[PDB]
Every structure is written in structure tokens, then in C-alpha cells.
Amino acid sequence: DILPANYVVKDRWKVLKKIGGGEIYEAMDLLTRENVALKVESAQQPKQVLKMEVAVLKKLQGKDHVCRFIGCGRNEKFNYVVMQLQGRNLADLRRSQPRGTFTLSTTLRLGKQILESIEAIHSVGFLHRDIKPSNFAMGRLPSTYRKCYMLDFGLARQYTNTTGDVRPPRNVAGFRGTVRYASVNAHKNREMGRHDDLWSLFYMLVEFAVGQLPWRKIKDKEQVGMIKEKYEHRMLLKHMPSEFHLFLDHIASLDYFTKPDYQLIMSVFENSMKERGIAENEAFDWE
Ligand SMILES: COc1cc2ncnc(Nc3cccc(O)c3)c2cc1OC
């Protein structure tokens, strides 16, 4: 641990505990009195990622589904970022379910919220590249307990320049993220694009509603990729709503350069809800 418990950052943020490990801590804000999330990076670290995380978090201020930026700093021993602390993550909430599945109501409403977060990061010129259940968390306040938040920009990459031109893909781009929700393109070590974050959303939603993915037990990265490539994705949609074939067909047609049709995907969730009598004001499964 970079920071021991009770350490005070800039005479304001007192360390309570390590939440996930850079390193992420729950801290006490001695000025405002609320608890906050505090992420640190050792100043000696070769590849410096938190400077990029701060840039992403700063460009997203105003958009829904992002933590409020509180502060940041650099010092001789560490670099740090302070942000609004969230609550329960989607991976822990799903494993807490009696069958390890969410209802279609929860799944569809989480899908809408995550897609908005995905379109938001893409609208500021970044790819997330690590879309997975544990990188999304519900709020911890009366005003945020039904809002889903996008977390961890440690694997993000700018896909544009200053003029909004799509930057050239590299010939090979070594994939760094998690295996389970990675698209086939990511497994092939090809430059990831906006469609690859949408592929991850698709695998997440299948898992939420079904409780498992076919490659779940496989640990070897290469084996998972080979199963995914050969796997008939239509078979994943057996117990999923019918419109998801439009979601799957659309993302399968995209390439690195092509801007996705976020409204086509959003209609897929909105029409699946409407055709089942699902309302926005509905209670989530953990409630
Ligand atoms: C209570 O649990 C958590 C609460 C969190 N609250 C805020 N941000 C988080 N992570 C985050 C957000 C933005 C960028 C970044 O690098 C990391 C959190 C992570 C948690 O789990 C570790």
C-alpha cells in the first residue's frame, strides 16, 4: 500500500481504507465531512496512467453517469485524484442474486444507463476499453441510489486528435483488458474502436439476463478468443429479446473508423421494455 490508514493528503483527505487497489482508497474529506474516493499513483511509476484518468474525468464533468471531480495533485512520492465515492458494483449485485441473474427489467434499465455512459466517453474522444460489470456502480445517496456510474479510466485511450479526426489504428495493439467481455477484435490484438466497447456491453447484458457466458470457465486468453470467433452469437440470443439481433447485426457490421448508431441500440432497449410493459420508475432487483 502506497498510503497507510490515517494518512492525510493535502491536510484534507484522511485515509480510511483501501477499496480496490495504482491504488484506490475510501477517504474522509476533513473540510466537507463526506467520504470520497481517492486514487493514487506512485511518482516513480514508469507508465503514468492517472494523469490521463484525470483528463478523462475532467472532460466528462456535466455528463450523467460520472463521479464528480473533487481534486488532484502531484508530489515527490505520489500523484493523486479525489472524486465522488460510489456504492455497490454491478458484479457484486449480480452474484448476490439468488440465481445469479437479474430480471429483464433490471438488465434493460442498466443497459440504457451504461450505453449513455459509453456514448458520453466516446463523445469526448476516448474509448473505455475495459467495459465490465465491476467497472459500474450504483450511487450511495438518496439523489443517486438508482443511477449507474462508469468507473476506472486506467485502460482508456484517446481515439481522436484535437479536430475530432479519428486517429490511425496501430497494425498491432496488444490487448490489456479483461478476457470475459473482450470483443473478438480485442482478442485478435487489433486496434480497438467504439464498436468494441459496445461488444462488451452486449456480453455484459447476455450475462446479466442468462447468469453465464459460454466461455466463463476458461482462463487462457487465446482459448476464449477462439471460442468467441467460432461461437454462433445468435445462439446467445435464444432467451434474450428478439430486437437484440439488430443490436448484434449492427455491431458486427462496424469497423474501427465507423461511428456507431447509438440510437439504434437505445431503441433496441426502449422497444424491448415498451413491448413488455417495463417502466423507468420500476424497482431494481436488489431493492
Ligand atoms: C465502493 O467501491 C468503489 C467506489 C468508487 N467510487 C468512485 N470511483 C471509483 N472508481 C474509479 C472511478 C473513476 C476512475 C477510477 O480510476 C476509479 C470507485 C471504485 C470502487 O470500487 C473500487
Q: Tell me how far the alpha carbon of residue 237 lies from the centroid of ligand 1, in angstroms.
A: 32
Q: Are residues 41 and 143 in the same domain?
A: no
Report yes or no on 236 lying in a domain: yes
Q: Are residues 92 and 81 in the same domain?
A: no
Distance of CA 156 to the CA centre of its chain: 10
Q: Are residues 126 and 72 in the same domain?
A: no
Q: Are residues 107 and 66 in the same domain?
A: no
Q: Would you list which residues are annotated within the binding site for ATP?
A: 19-24, 39
| PDB resolution in Å | 2.0
Measured CA to CA, the distance from residue 118 to residue 124 in angstroms comes to 10
Neighbours of 46 (CB within 10 A): 5
Neighbours of 22 (CB within 10 A): 20
Q: Are residues 278 and 257 in the same domain?
A: yes
On whether the CB atoms of residues 215 and 180 are closer than 8 A, the answer is yes
53 in contact with ligand 1, CB cutoff 6 A: yes
User: Could you identify the residue written with the cell 449480480?
Assistant: 94
188: region left, alpha or beta (phi > 0 left; psi from -120 to 50 alpha)? alpha
HSE (side-chain half, CA atoms, 13 Å) at 246: 15
Report yes or no on 76 lying in a domain: yes
Helices (H), ranges, 47-148 = 50-59, 90-95, 104-123
Query: What is the grid cell recorded at 44?
Result: 516513480
137 in contact with ligand 1, CB cutoff 6 A: yes
Distance of CA 11 to the CA centre of its chain: 32
Strands 148-150 and 8-9, sheet pairing = unpaired
Which burial class, exposed, middle or buried, applies to 212 when counting CB atoms under 10 A from its CB (0-12, 13-18, 19+)?
exposed
Determination approach? X-ray
Report yes or no on 190 lying in a domain: yes
Q: Are residues 78 and 97 in the same domain?
A: no
Q: Tell me the residue length of the chain.
A: 287
On whether the CB atoms of residues 199 and 183 are closer than 8 A, the answer is yes
Per the annotation, the verdict on 29 as an active-site residue is no
Smallest CA-to-CA distance from 64 within 132, 146, 130, 152 is with 146
> Which of 16, 63, 67 best tests ligand 1's pocket when mutated (most atoms within 8 Å of CB)?
67
Query: What is the grid cell recorded at 280?
Result: 423507468
Instruction: Read off the DSSP letter of residue 166.
Output: B
Order of strands across the sheet that contains 23-29: 8-9, 13-18, 23-29, 35-42, 78-84, 69-74
Q: In degrees, to the nearest 5, what angle opens at C-alpha 184 toward C-alphas 227 and 114?
A: 115
